[PDB]
Amino acid sequence: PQITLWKRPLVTIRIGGQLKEALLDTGADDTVIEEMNLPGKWKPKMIGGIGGFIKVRQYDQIPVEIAGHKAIGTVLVGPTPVNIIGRNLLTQIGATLNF
Amino acid sequence: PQITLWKRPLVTIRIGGQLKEALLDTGADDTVIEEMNLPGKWKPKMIGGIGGFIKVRQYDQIPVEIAGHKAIGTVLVGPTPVNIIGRNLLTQIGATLNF
Numbered sequence: 001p002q003i004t005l006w007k008r009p010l011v012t013i014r015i016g017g018q019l020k021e022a023l024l025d026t027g028a029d030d031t032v033i034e035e036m037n038l039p040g041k042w043k044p045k046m047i048g049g050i051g052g053f054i055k056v057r058q059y060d061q062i063p064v065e066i067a068g069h070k071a072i073g074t075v076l077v078g079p080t081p082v083n084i085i086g087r088n089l090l091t092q093i094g095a096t097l098n099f
Numbered sequence: 100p101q102i103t104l105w106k107r108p109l110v111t112i113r114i115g116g117q118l119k120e121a122l123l124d125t126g127a128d129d130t131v132i133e134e135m136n137l138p139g140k141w142k143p144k145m146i147g148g149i150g151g152f153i154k155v156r157q158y159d160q161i162p163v164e165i166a167g168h169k170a171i172g173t174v175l176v177g178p179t180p181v182n183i184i185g186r187n188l189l190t191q192i193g194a195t196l197n198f
């Protein structure tokens with residue numbers, strides 16, 4: 001689908017059997033979801049953005065369905081203001097910026 | 100043009116007579132430019148991102164040319180690690196997300 005940017009590009013995703021709303025973020029290298037219980041082993045990690053660095057739990061090969069499109073990749077879980085879909089998963093569903 | 104997301108979506112912009120490299124960010128509500136001496140009156144502001152908040156100076160009606168696309172709007176100047184072109188300016192150049 002073609003998404004204009006007048007409003008925040010928030011879409012419904014499905015992860016861990018749960019449906020959530022996430023922001024399609026082209027400025028985020030990785031995908032960071034709000035604290036939740038995800039199956040499997042996780043590795044402590046530190047990511048940085050605007051405002052500072054935060055500690056996250058890194059999960060690998062996590063299946064995520066974005067607007068009906070399937071992706072399987074790394075998902076970081078931590079104290080984020082909003083669920084973010086980064087370039088690691090955006091490239092999987094073939095998302096591009098057009099103008 | 101069509102920009103893929105394998106790497107960070109960096110483009111050349113023109114602001115205040117200077118050519119800069121900025122990141123096309125669909126996850127940013129506003130546009131944040133690295134510290135530069137822009138003339139005119141500004142309003143102090145605090146924007147929140149991933150690791151917290153940072154203080155910026157808000158300039159309005161600033162002309163910014165994005166890859167040959169003339170746009171004009173609010174620009175926040177602060178200690179950002181990278182120039183960020185937000186939705187306020189992306190909507191003006193007709194930018195969309197497609198997948």
Ligand SMILES: CC[C@H](C)[C@@H]1NC(=O)[C@@H](NC[C@@H](O)C[C@@H](Cc2ccccc2)C(=O)N[C@H]2c3ccccc3C[C@H]2O)Cc2ccc(cc2)OCCCCCNC1=O
Pocket residue numbers: 023025026027028029030031032047048049050081082084086122124126127128129131146147148149180181183
């Ligand atoms: C610059 C971003 C502005 C300040 C902010 N947006 C973000 O921070 C949004 N994402 C910001 C990123 O697109 C910016 C982008 C800028 C950058 C780029 C390269 C190197 C350093 C910093 C970044 O942080 N990127 C980092 C990131 C984010 C998530 C996961 C991994 C990583 C790694 C790194 O790329 C998420 C958000 C947060 C609070 C929100 C709403 C959305 O509250 C609600 C809105 C609050 C007011 C509006 N604020 C925003 O739109």
